[PDB]
């Protein structure tokens, strides 16, 4: 339905950035691979991984923020041309994977 970053991190969209951290915790503790192993859940932790990508790292905040996933994904105001793709396809920023991140920040721990 929607890929709303705080509902996919479990708590309120006017939550704290101590409160974001500590509800990706529990998520990428939920689909961390010592706790979690499913084709497809995979990519939902890639979601969520994203969802704390960009409140994590202001440059995708911003984004995010302004407009919303679609604005990120390449299907928001602009939907279709995705920034400068123009006729090229493109996910969610999946590199940008801050379960290293977590691995510095928590270190798949509680």
């Given amino acids: ?3 709303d970053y705080y509902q996919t ?6 939550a704290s ?4 951290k500590r509800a990706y915790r529990r998520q990428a503790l939920r689909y961390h691979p010592d706790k979690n192993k499913e084709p497809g859940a995979e990519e939902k932790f890639k979601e969520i991984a994203e969802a704390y990508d960009v409140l ?3 440059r995708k905040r911003e984004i995010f923020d302004r407009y919303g996933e679609e604005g990120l994904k390449g299907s928001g105001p602009s939907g279709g041309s995705g920034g400068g793709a123009n006729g090229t396809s493109f996910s969610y920023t999946f590199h940008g994977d801050p379960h ?5 920040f928590f270190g798949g721990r509680n």
């Fill in 100 to 104: 290293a991140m977590f691995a510095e």
């Fill in 17 to 20: 950035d101590e409160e974001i």
């Fill in 56 to 58: 994590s790292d202001p």
């Fill in 1 to 3: 339905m929607g890929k």
């Fill in 9 to 14: 991190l479990g708590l309120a969209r006017g």
